[PDB]
Design an enzyme around this catalytic site. Structure first.
Site, PDB file in Angstrom:
ATOM      1  N   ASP A   1      -9.263  19.302  13.460  1.00 55.81           N
ATOM      2  CA  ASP A   1      -8.645  19.133  12.154  1.00 55.81           C
ATOM      3  C   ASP A   1      -9.356  20.052  11.136  1.00 55.81           C
ATOM      4  O   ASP A   1      -9.925  21.106  11.505  1.00 55.81           O
ATOM      5  CB  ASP A   1      -8.734  17.632  11.753  1.00 55.81           C
ATOM      6  CG  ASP A   1      -7.578  17.173  10.886  1.00 55.81           C
ATOM      7  OD1 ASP A   1      -7.481  17.706   9.737  1.00 55.81           O
ATOM      8  OD2 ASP A   1      -6.748  16.283  11.261  1.00 55.81           O
TER       9      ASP A   1
ATOM     10  N   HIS B   1      -7.998  16.384   4.565  1.00 56.40           N
ATOM     11  CA  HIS B   1      -7.136  15.801   5.579  1.00 56.40           C
ATOM     12  C   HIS B   1      -7.973  15.292   6.778  1.00 56.40           C
ATOM     13  O   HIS B   1      -7.787  14.129   7.202  1.00 56.40           O
ATOM     14  CB  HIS B   1      -6.119  16.835   6.031  1.00 56.40           C
ATOM     15  CG  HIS B   1      -5.188  16.364   7.112  1.00 56.40           C
ATOM     16  ND1 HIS B   1      -5.452  16.550   8.450  1.00 56.40           N
ATOM     17  CD2 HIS B   1      -3.952  15.810   7.043  1.00 56.40           C
ATOM     18  CE1 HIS B   1      -4.425  16.118   9.158  1.00 56.40           C
ATOM     19  NE2 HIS B   1      -3.514  15.632   8.330  1.00 56.40           N
TER      20      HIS B   1
ATOM     21  N   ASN C   1       6.663  15.890  11.123  1.00 50.41           N
ATOM     22  CA  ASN C   1       7.284  15.249   9.956  1.00 50.41           C
ATOM     23  C   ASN C   1       8.628  15.925   9.634  1.00 50.41           C
ATOM     24  O   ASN C   1       9.006  16.072   8.447  1.00 50.41           O
ATOM     25  CB  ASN C   1       6.402  15.350   8.696  1.00 50.41           C
ATOM     26  CG  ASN C   1       5.047  14.653   8.872  1.00 50.41           C
ATOM     27  OD1 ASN C   1       4.920  13.680   9.658  1.00 50.41           O
ATOM     28  ND2 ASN C   1       4.059  15.108   8.125  1.00 50.41           N
TER      29      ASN C   1
ATOM     30  N   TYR D   1       4.495  18.784  24.212  1.00 47.93           N
ATOM     31  CA  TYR D   1       4.094  18.948  25.628  1.00 47.93           C
ATOM     32  C   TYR D   1       3.918  17.592  26.337  1.00 47.93           C
ATOM     33  O   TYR D   1       3.331  16.641  25.759  1.00 47.93           O
ATOM     34  CB  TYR D   1       2.767  19.721  25.715  1.00 47.93           C
ATOM     35  CG  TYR D   1       2.832  21.139  25.209  1.00 47.93           C
ATOM     36  CD1 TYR D   1       3.782  22.032  25.717  1.00 47.93           C
ATOM     37  CD2 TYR D   1       1.956  21.593  24.224  1.00 47.93           C
ATOM     38  CE1 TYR D   1       3.865  23.331  25.258  1.00 47.93           C
ATOM     39  CE2 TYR D   1       2.005  22.927  23.762  1.00 47.93           C
ATOM     40  CZ  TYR D   1       2.960  23.779  24.302  1.00 47.93           C
ATOM     41  OH  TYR D   1       3.046  25.068  23.869  1.00 47.93           O
TER      42      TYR D   1
ATOM     43  N   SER E   1       0.425  12.491  10.773  1.00 48.88           N
ATOM     44  CA  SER E   1      -1.046  12.680  10.819  1.00 48.88           C
ATOM     45  C   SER E   1      -1.844  11.363  10.749  1.00 48.88           C
ATOM     46  O   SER E   1      -2.967  11.282  11.283  1.00 48.88           O
ATOM     47  CB  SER E   1      -1.577  13.487   9.646  1.00 48.88           C
ATOM     48  OG  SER E   1      -1.383  14.874   9.817  1.00 48.88           O
TER      49      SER E   1
HETATM   50 NA    NA Z   1       4.096  14.811  24.599  1.00 52.30          NA
END
Ligand code: NA
Ligand SMILES: [Ca+2]
Lengths: 281, 63
Positions: free
Chosen positions: A32, A64, A155, A171, A221
């Site tokens: 992050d 964040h 989002n 993935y 997030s």
């Molecule tokens: Na996935």
């Protein structure tokens, strides 16, 4: 006095805390924007920066990463908020700069650092609309190596019948997490599609912010670190469970909500996940 | 208005002007297309993803 943010209660983390399990000895990489290690409600165990112009991973110039870290592992004490896994060993793996963005190679270098440093869990509250072979290879390698990898779904909200889950959430090897509010309603911004795996609280989530502050943020997030923290609780109770088993336990014990296109398997329930026998509630 | 598909292919300058007419309090941030970004949702923010020529390369949206 400490406060327990609603999302920590909603995923039933206090049930694990009362059994005596809080994520002790489990290594979680927050990949992050850095983590403010001076915050009195966080303990950062280590980390590294892959951002060429911002070399200190313990300085968070965006805010964040610090908020995400507090949802994973804000300390159990008499201040601030309580984290999902308050005893977890927390690592700041800085791959995003002040403006909240990073090059794909920075994220990949961070996933590689996590593998080399024997992280048990990676949280990636981050994403983009396109993948790359090298990004897929890095997450696949982490999972092959035994790491639980959890990421924000994105989002992007809805787009008719199209999936809007971004990468690396999209993935198969990565647990993609969408956002619900305190009533278990999908947040309107939460990405959708068959790649959405589970949901967690991601509306008005109170957590740690740099300079000894706290604040409520929204986003997938915010949902992702509930699930990364849950994985650490589960591993502290079952330290031999593989990442395969941790992932199955979370998927197999969700509270089912709506259609899986919009909600995946539903809201995680870490109490049910950490039992030996799993079913949905 | 929370998305501007009509701005794809325009200059970053024209995009900023248009978005600020629709949303004068917008916090606009310009980023390279093909980067990875945080997944917080901020109703006041509009990220503009530009190609190497400084033209908009992805539909701008609030968030
Ligand atoms: Na996935
Ligand atoms: Ca605390």
């Amino acid at each position: 006095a400490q406060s327990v943010p609603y999302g920590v209660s909603q995923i039933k983390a206090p049930a694990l805390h009362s059994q005596g399990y809080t994520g002790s000895n489990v290594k979680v990489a927050v990949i992050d924007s850095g983590i403010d290690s001076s915050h009195p409600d966080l303990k950062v165990a280590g980390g590294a920066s892959m951002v060429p112009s911002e070399t200190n991973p313990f300085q968070d110039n965006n805010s964040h990463g610090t908020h995400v870290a507090g949802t994973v592992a804000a300390l159990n004490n008499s201040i601030g908020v309580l984290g999902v896994a308050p005893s977890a060993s927390l690592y700041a793996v800085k791959v995003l700069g002040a403006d909240g963005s990073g090059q794909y190679s920075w994220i990949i270098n961070g996933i590689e650092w996590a593998i080399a440093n024997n992280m048990d869990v990676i949280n990636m509250s981050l994403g983009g609309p396109s993948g790359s072979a090298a990004l897929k290879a890095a997450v696949d390698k982490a999972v092959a190596s035994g790491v639980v990898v959890v990421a924000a779904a994105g989002n992007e909200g809805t787009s008719g019948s199209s999936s809007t889950v971004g990468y690396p959430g999209k993935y198969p090897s990565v647990i993609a997490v969408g956002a619900v509010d305190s009533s278990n309603q999908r947040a309107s911004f939460s990405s959708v599609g068959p790649e959405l795996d589970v949901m967690a609280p991601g509306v008005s989530i109170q957590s740690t912010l740099p300079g000894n502050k706290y604040g409520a943020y929204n986003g997938t997030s915010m949902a992702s670190p509930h699930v990364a923290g849950a994985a650490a609780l589960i591993l502290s109770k079952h330290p031999n469970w593989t990442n395969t088993q941790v992932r199955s336990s979370l998927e197999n014990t969700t509270t089912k909500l709506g259609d899986s296109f919009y909600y995946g398997k539903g809201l995680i329930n870490v109490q049910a996940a950490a039992q030996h026998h799993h079913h949905h509630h | 208005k929370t998305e501007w598909p009509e701005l794809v292919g325009k200059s970053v300058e024209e995009a900023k002007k248009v978005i600020l007419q629709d949303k004068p309090a917008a916090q606009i941030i310009v980023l390279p297309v093909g980067t990875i970004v945080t997944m917080s949702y901020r109703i006041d923010r509009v990220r503009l993803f530009v190609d190497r020529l400084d033209n908009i390369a992805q539909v701008p949206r609030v968030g």
